[PDB]
Amino acid sequence: RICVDHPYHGMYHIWTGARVAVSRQRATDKIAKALSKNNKVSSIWPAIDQTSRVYHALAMDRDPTRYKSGQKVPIKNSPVGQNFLSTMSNNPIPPPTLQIEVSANLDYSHVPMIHKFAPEMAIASGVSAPKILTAIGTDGRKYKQLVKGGNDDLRQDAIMEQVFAAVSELLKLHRETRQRNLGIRTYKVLPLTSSSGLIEFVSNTIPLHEYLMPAHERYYPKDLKGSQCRKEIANAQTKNTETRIAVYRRVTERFHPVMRYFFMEYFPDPDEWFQKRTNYTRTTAAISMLGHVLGLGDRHGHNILLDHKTGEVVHIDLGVAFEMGRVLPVPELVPFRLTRDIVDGMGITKTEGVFRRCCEFTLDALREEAASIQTILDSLRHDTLYQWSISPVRMAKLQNSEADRAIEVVKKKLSKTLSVMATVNDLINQATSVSNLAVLYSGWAAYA
């Protein structure tokens, strides 16, 4: 009944389930056969069927010669590309990465369908080339998409994106966090198979590392490059803590933050500048507290996007949660990312003022909703397919009862024993400590 009333919210789950795992597959196959039999959803299920087949075929198709990392190839020179374009013309659907709100009136006609595809697609650097498609909708907007193939696990990312969105919705029920619009920015992950997915390409952002590494040499031509800092930190990785801390101090004495310019060169008007810098500080505070409470890790510069229209940060790739990150070979022993460049963008009063007050308001509202967060994590506990450890496949892809333990850690981070002021003080002390930042992995660019 859910898939019949709200097809764009249930039919991709049914498709993934069909195309104790054998029993689940059989039941979802029966539901799919029944869906392609009734009159309400009979022109929607075949469209999703054919379209998902061609999206998956396009995802799996990796050819190092035909798909060169960094280029921009017109998607008609492969047979997969032409089959994809034909099938997508013959079957109209909404863009699979568009977030559709649920309609109480049960009317999903006002939803933009895919009109056409831009002729070309970009390609990113990797082994299984992630391709960035663009779809022009009926209303004339551009929906970009990563068509991700390989052996990754997007269901972890999708589950955690849903959990984070639910907790941020909890934040709207309190006067102090609602007055400041404290919340997180969401995106859409859609797992197609156990090896492929569609990720929503967030519209007009730029990765934090792609801004920071050119800016460091543009504004300080006498400083070290970013690669030189990374190499100097990686060479002293198998040495005692004293040598690591000494090398880290030596490297950050020749590397100065440049984040304060992001706002001076995208917003030259002081009114806009002030508003966008406040947006940056507030969204950073909210995601810092929320990711401390849920153990969010893997917070390097390629998982953080800067929105250069509104100034706020977007966190993607949210799959390493519940402290899975301090089990890695070189552990991540910081509560959140608060390097010198993150703090440089906050202004002349570095962490005092907006950041610390918004951290305190967020944490105070979170530990007043510990029952609802317990309910959300309990719903997570009855999910058969969610893994509470990090399988060595992704653990090797990252650095070159488990439910009960995790939920108990979360529950004791929300305890009212200490005050919010003291808790936030301790968190900001251990997030900016040079003895904690010096022993982080080199790909987690802490010097930056």
């Binding site: 031509p221 030259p268 002081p270 500048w273 002030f274 009063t349 003022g353 907006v354």
Partner: protein
């Protein structure tokens, strides 16, 4: 044709000796028939075609004055003009719209009730509030039009709790970016400024502007200047771009202090700068326009400064040296007659920060246009009430280094949390200052009572100020009787807020006061001392008019601004309940209160 028709029909309707009048009437009839029969493929959409039809038809039948009643011709015309003003592809232009508005709104007629009003719903008011504020920022508007504009702004604020964004901007960078559009150069900005003089001047001004444009476009066509050609082809429409070309034929002390105080500093300095660069054809045709036209020098100052500085970049940098030496004296200038030129200096510095220097690596080199001491500029912008500009300058200064002005910035900038990031030495007094900034309740009453006792006992002279603070605190709580007793022992807002809360309707209210509490108090007092609803309506309308006139006065911080908007909202709700006629209207007023509660749950606490 839309603007010409509107202006012509308006001036005829005002103009309507016997034979001349009959000829004018026959022309009016012929012209209205022509316009009714007019139809063009050049209409952007069909919305523009219906707007054209409505404007022309309603203008053809207006009276001498304007009103706001629902269904007349004058109110339909006013609503069309306002709806057209806020758009992207607008039919009218500034001179025609100004003529129409000075005809309609010169002598106005505000409806008694609000059920007979052309704007009566909260949604109409939210939609049209920005344009109605943009309109009531002239000088040729009657009192009843300002009362009507206050009613619309008050209904918009009571329905949304949001300030129109024209009241919140503090720099002119938006206008400089609207002018220098298409390419983004100062030449396009000057060309737009000069082009706007052809359609909006008298004979003399339009003649000067047409002469300037002819010189510029001809000397750009002959000399094959591609930059200036690209500026002209995007600043001027084609008919004006063709009438400016002599195709066969041939074309027929300031730099010192105390000069910031005469009201013609900008004009003299602009002429002095533009004369120093004869090779630029756009600056050569300026001194006539700068000297004749009024208010042109202030609008054109940044473009002139930038053009001169960019011209003599590789040559001997004379204007840079002179301006950067004078700025050391101009920025440290505390004066009332000099504030309005200091604003223009700050806006010029801001504008130069957005222009790329030729041969630059980063934006950190745009600090080389002039040589500004950013601490002095921050202090100057704090004196002028531009606190976000002051914060930006303070940050640039701090970068130049690698705190007495930062306190004045953070006390007044509009953010809940920024003030708490400033570091200041600790004491009971500083904690009290933070608690009174924070508007705490009993927590500041404790510290203030301790100070006040200690100052009364020691016969200190600060106790007076202490009492003041206490009264302020006791009004932020709701304890009105205590603040009344503290006032009777010897502010204005406190006096009249307390009198209204306790319902003491016999205070002699001052006349011509800038306090919102006095305005609201006079309305309620008149409601107490009156036997006819007409006296009360007159007092409410005088309150709305005076409040709008005070909002237009300019230099207000954000707290005072929102207090005035809340006074407008209060007077509008008073006027709404004074005009109920039956039970259904009473229930509709109650339902309106409920919807506004929906907005109020999340809004700022002072306004609510």
């Amino acid at each position: 044709l839309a603007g010409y028709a509107l202006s012509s029909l308006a001036d005829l309707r005002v103009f309507l000796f016997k034979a001349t009048k009959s000829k004018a009437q026959e022309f009016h009839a012929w012209f209205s028939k022509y316009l009714a029969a007019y139809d063009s493929p050049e209409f952007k959409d069909e919305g523009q075609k219906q707007a054209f039809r409505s404007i022309t038809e309603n203008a053809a039948h207006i009276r001498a004055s304007g009103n706001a009643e629902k269904g007349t011709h004058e109110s339909n015309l006013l609503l069309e003009i306002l709806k057209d003003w806020g758009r992207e592809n607008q039919l009218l232009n500034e001179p025609a719209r100004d003529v129409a508005l000075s005809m309609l709104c010169g002598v106005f007629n505000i409806p008694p009730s609000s059920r007979l009003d052309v704007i009566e719903t909260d949604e109409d008011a939210i939609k049209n509030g920005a344009v109605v504020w943009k309109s009531c920022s002239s000088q040729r508007l009657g009192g009843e039009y300002l009362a009507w504009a206050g009613r619309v702004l008050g209904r918009s604020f009571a329905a949304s709790g949001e300030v129109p964004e024209d009241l919140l901007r503090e720099s002119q960078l938006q206008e400089y970016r609207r002018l220098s559009q298409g390419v983004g150069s100062s030449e396009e900005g000057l060309l737009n400024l000069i082009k706007s003089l052809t359609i909006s001047g008298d004979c003399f001004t339009a003649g000067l502007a047409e002469a300037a444009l002819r010189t510029i476009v001809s000397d750009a066509i002959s000399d094959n200047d591609h930059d200036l050609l690209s500026a002209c082809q995007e600043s001027l429409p084609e008919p004006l771009l063709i009438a400016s070309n002599w195709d066969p034929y041939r074309t027929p002390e300031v730099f010192s202090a105390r000069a910031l105080e005469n009201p013609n500093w900008s004009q003299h300095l602009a002429i002095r700068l533009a004369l120093s660069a004869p090779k630029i054809v756009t600056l050569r045709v300026l001194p006539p326009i700068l000297s004749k036209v009024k208010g042109f020098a202030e609008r054109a100052f940044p473009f002139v400064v930038h053009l001169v500085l960019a011209y003599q970049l590789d040559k001997q940098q004379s204007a840079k040296r002179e301006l950067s030496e004078s700025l050391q004296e101009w920025l440290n200038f505390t004066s009332e007659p000099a504030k309005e030129n200091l604003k223009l200096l700050i806006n010029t510095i801001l504008y130069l920060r957005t222009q790329p220097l030729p041969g630059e690596s980063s934006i950190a080199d745009r600090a080389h246009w002039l040589d500004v001491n950013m601490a002095s500029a921050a202090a100057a912008a704090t004196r002028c009430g531009m606190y976000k500009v002051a914060l930006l300058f303070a940050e640039l200064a701090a970068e130049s280094t690698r705190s007495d002005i930062l306190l004045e910035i953070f006390e007044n900038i509009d953010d809940p949390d920024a003030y708490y990031g400033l570091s200041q030495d600790a004491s009971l007094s500083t904690v009290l200052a933070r608690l009174e900034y924070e508007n705490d309740g009993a927590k500041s009453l404790a510290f203030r009572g301790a100070q006040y006792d200690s100052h009364l006992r020691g016969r200190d002279l600060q106790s007076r100020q202490d009492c003041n603070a206490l009264i302020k605190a006791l009004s932020s709580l709701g304890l009105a009787g205590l603040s009344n007793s503290l006032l009777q022992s010897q502010s204005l807002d406190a006096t009249f807020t307390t009198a209204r809360k306790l319902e003491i309707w016999n205070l002699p209210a001052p006349v011509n006061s800038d306090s919102w509490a006095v305005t609201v108090y006079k309305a309620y007092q008149s409601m107490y001392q009156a036997q006819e609803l007409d006296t009360v309506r007159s007092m409410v309308h005088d309150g709305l008019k005076n409040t709008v006139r005070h909002l237009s006065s300019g230099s207000l911080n954000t707290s005072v601004l929102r207090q005035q908007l809340g006074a407008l909202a209060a007077l509008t709700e008073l006027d709404d309940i004074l005009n109920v006629r039956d039970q259904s209207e009473l229930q509709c007023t109650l339902a309106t209160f409920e919807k506004r509660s929906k907005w109020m749950m999340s809004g700022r606490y002072a306004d609510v």
